[PDB]
Scaffold this motif. Structure first.
Motif, short mmCIF file in Angstrom:
data_model
loop_
_atom_site.label_atom_id
_atom_site.label_comp_id
_atom_site.label_asym_id
_atom_site.label_seq_id
_atom_site.Cartn_x
_atom_site.Cartn_y
_atom_site.Cartn_z
N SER A 66 41.10 5.02 -27.05
CA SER A 66 41.61 5.88 -28.14
C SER A 66 41.41 5.20 -29.46
CB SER A 66 43.11 6.15 -27.94
OG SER A 66 43.61 7.16 -28.80
N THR A 67 41.02 5.95 -30.51
CA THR A 67 40.77 5.31 -31.83
C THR A 67 41.72 5.75 -32.95
OG1 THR A 67 39.11 6.92 -32.57
CG2 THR A 67 38.26 5.04 -31.24
N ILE A 68 42.58 6.71 -32.66
CA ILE A 68 43.49 7.34 -33.65
C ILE A 68 44.49 6.42 -34.37
CG2 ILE A 68 43.02 9.53 -32.46
CD1 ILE A 68 45.85 9.48 -31.44
N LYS A 69 44.69 5.21 -33.92
CA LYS A 69 45.67 4.32 -34.54
C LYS A 69 45.00 3.21 -35.33
CE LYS A 69 49.35 4.67 -31.06
NZ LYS A 69 50.53 5.21 -31.76
N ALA A 84 30.81 8.77 -26.45
CA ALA A 84 31.21 7.61 -27.25
C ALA A 84 31.33 7.90 -28.74
CB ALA A 84 30.23 6.47 -27.02
N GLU A 85 32.28 7.24 -29.39
CA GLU A 85 32.50 7.32 -30.84
C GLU A 85 32.33 5.92 -31.37
OE1 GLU A 85 35.43 11.20 -31.42
OE2 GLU A 85 36.44 9.23 -31.42
N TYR A 86 31.61 5.77 -32.49
CA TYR A 86 31.41 4.47 -33.12
C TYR A 86 32.11 4.52 -34.46
CZ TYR A 86 27.98 3.54 -29.49
OH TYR A 86 27.38 3.34 -28.28
N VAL A 87 32.99 3.53 -34.71
CA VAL A 87 33.81 3.48 -35.90
C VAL A 87 33.65 2.17 -36.60
CG1 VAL A 87 36.04 4.31 -36.88
CG2 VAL A 87 35.58 4.69 -34.43
N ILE A 88 33.48 2.27 -37.92
CA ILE A 88 33.45 1.19 -38.91
C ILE A 88 34.56 1.50 -39.93
CG2 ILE A 88 31.15 0.28 -38.48
CD1 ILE A 88 30.37 2.16 -41.18
N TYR A 89 35.03 0.48 -40.60
CA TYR A 89 36.16 0.68 -41.51
C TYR A 89 35.84 0.21 -42.88
CZ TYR A 89 38.20 1.55 -37.00
OH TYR A 89 38.41 2.05 -35.75
N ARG A 90 34.54 0.01 -43.10
CA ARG A 90 33.97 -0.38 -44.37
C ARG A 90 32.71 0.41 -44.57
NH1 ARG A 90 34.74 -6.16 -46.05
NH2 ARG A 90 36.86 -6.73 -45.36
N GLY A 91 32.64 1.14 -45.69
CA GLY A 91 31.48 1.95 -46.07
C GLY A 91 30.17 1.17 -46.20
N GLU A 92 30.27 -0.14 -46.54
CA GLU A 92 29.10 -1.03 -46.68
C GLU A 92 28.47 -1.36 -45.35
OE1 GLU A 92 32.17 -2.51 -49.88
OE2 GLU A 92 32.22 -1.78 -47.80
N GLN A 93 29.13 -1.00 -44.23
CA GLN A 93 28.56 -1.27 -42.94
C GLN A 93 27.60 -0.21 -42.45
OE1 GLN A 93 32.03 -4.06 -41.53
NE2 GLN A 93 31.01 -3.13 -39.81
N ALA A 94 27.35 0.79 -43.28
CA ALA A 94 26.40 1.82 -42.90
C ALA A 94 25.46 2.18 -44.04
CB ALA A 94 27.10 3.04 -42.38
N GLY A 137 41.24 8.17 -36.32
CA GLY A 137 41.84 7.05 -37.04
C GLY A 137 41.30 7.00 -38.46
N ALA A 138 41.67 5.96 -39.19
CA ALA A 138 41.25 5.79 -40.58
C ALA A 138 39.90 5.10 -40.69
CB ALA A 138 42.32 5.05 -41.35
N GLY A 139 38.87 5.78 -40.21
CA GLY A 139 37.56 5.15 -40.21
C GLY A 139 36.42 6.06 -40.45
N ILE A 140 35.20 5.45 -40.53
CA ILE A 140 33.91 6.14 -40.69
C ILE A 140 33.32 6.31 -39.27
CG2 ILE A 140 31.63 6.10 -41.86
CD1 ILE A 140 33.25 3.85 -43.74
N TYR A 141 33.19 7.56 -38.83
CA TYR A 141 32.78 7.91 -37.47
C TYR A 141 31.32 8.24 -37.30
CZ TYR A 141 37.57 7.84 -35.59
OH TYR A 141 38.82 7.48 -35.14
N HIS A 143 34.12 -6.07 -35.83
CA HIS A 143 33.59 -5.42 -37.04
C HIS A 143 33.49 -3.95 -36.88
CE1 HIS A 143 32.28 -9.59 -36.79
NE2 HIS A 143 32.77 -9.65 -38.03
N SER A 144 33.70 -3.49 -35.65
CA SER A 144 33.62 -2.07 -35.33
C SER A 144 34.42 -1.79 -34.09
CB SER A 144 32.16 -1.62 -35.15
OG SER A 144 31.49 -2.38 -34.16
N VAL A 145 34.65 -0.50 -33.83
CA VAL A 145 35.40 -0.02 -32.69
C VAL A 145 34.61 1.05 -32.02
CG1 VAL A 145 37.44 1.36 -31.97
CG2 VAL A 145 37.72 -0.70 -33.45
N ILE A 146 34.57 1.00 -30.68
CA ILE A 146 33.88 2.01 -29.93
C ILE A 146 34.86 2.74 -29.03
CG2 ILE A 146 31.92 2.61 -28.39
CD1 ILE A 146 30.54 -0.10 -29.29
N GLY A 147 34.93 4.05 -29.22
CA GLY A 147 35.69 4.95 -28.37
C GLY A 147 34.85 5.15 -27.14
N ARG A 148 35.31 4.62 -26.02
CA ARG A 148 34.61 4.64 -24.74
C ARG A 148 34.85 5.95 -23.98
NH1 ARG A 148 36.87 0.71 -22.75
NH2 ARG A 148 35.55 -1.04 -22.08
N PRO A 149 33.78 6.60 -23.46
CA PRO A 149 34.00 7.80 -22.63
C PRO A 149 34.88 7.48 -21.40
CG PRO A 149 31.69 7.59 -23.26
CD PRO A 149 32.35 6.28 -23.57
#
Ligand SMILES: C[C@H]1Cn2c(nnc2C(F)(F)F)CN1C(=O)c1cccc(C(F)(F)c2n[nH]c(=O)c3ccccc23)c1
Ligand SMILES: [Zn+2]
Length: 210
Positions: free
Chosen positions: A160-163, A186-196, A105-109, A172-178
């Motif tokens: 799924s995180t692709i959408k 697991a995948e951890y996704v943020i959509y703001r660069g300031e969150q990391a 998806g459109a995120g920071i993984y 504030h975040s999304v977790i791709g669950r096994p």
């Protein structure tokens, strides 16, 4: 802009980072194609990334996230593998480089497993491997990965995180669950660069099993 501080191998901080790196190694579905075949790393050096502007943006956003999530910013230490370390340590993570595709998806993984991030050190699928030997399983060339402070806030768990272009409402975040029909890890996704914050820069080699 950015300063690197060397941690001593005998210091508690260095040891904590190495143990989290070593203990999160897993066997991958691709049989080691992307990241190489190993069950251990040889840690060369661990550096602390110091960037004033990046820390300001990170701290400001953390305060906001906790103010939205009943005073719980839920900070997690997570791995990030990338051929663009230099850009990340100077500019930070940038969701504008991300987009919706067939794999992401459109995120920071981020990964909680160092070996998952190790699969992206040379690019998606390990790219062409190390620039010197064109080997994805190179045991010689020094690799680098980041061990980051990630402001997760309220996470949304999904298969799924692709959408995803952003986290769902109130999250504030999304977790791709096994899952058996999905992700192995697991995948951890943020959509703001300031969150990391790219806290640690790890220089290592993958080790060839005996
Ligand atoms: C747009 C990129 C590059 N990106 C970003 N910020 N700046 C840039 C750059 F363009 F400068 F490189 C933030 N971003 C990422 O986060 C990103 C986005 C999609 C896919 C990946 C990945 F496939 F390459 C990946 N790498 N590394 C991992 O550890 C990892 C762990 C779990 C799953 C996937 C992955 C990274
Ligand atoms: Zn090499």
């Amino acid at each position: 802009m950015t300063i690197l501080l060397d941690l001593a191998p005998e210091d508690k901080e260095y040891q904590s980072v190495e143990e989290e790196m070593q203990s999160t190694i897993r066997e991958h579905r691709d049989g080691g194609n992307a990241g190489g075949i190993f069950n251990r790393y040889n840690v060369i050096r661990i550096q602390k990334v110091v960037n004033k502007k990046l820390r300001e943006r990170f701290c400001h956003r953390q305060k906001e996230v906790s103010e939205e999530n009943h005073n719980h910013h839920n900070e997690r230490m997570l791995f990030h593998g990338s051929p663009f370390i230099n850009a990340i340590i100077h500019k930070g993570f940038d969701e504008r480089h991300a987009y919706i595709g067939g794999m992401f998806g459109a995120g920071i993984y981020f990964a909680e497993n160092s070996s998952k991030s190790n699969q992206y050190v040379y690019g998606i699928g390990g790219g062409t491997g190390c620039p010197t030997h064109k080997d994805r399983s190179c045991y010689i060339c020094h690799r680098q990965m980041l061990f980051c402070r990630v402001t997760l806030g309220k996470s949304f768990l999904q298969f799924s995180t692709i959408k995803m272009a952003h986290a769902p409402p109130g999250h504030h975040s999304v977790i791709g669950r096994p899952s058996v029909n999905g992700l192995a890890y697991a995948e951890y996704v943020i959509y703001r660069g300031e969150q990391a914050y790219p806290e640690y820069l790890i220089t290592y080699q993958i080790m060839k099993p005996e």
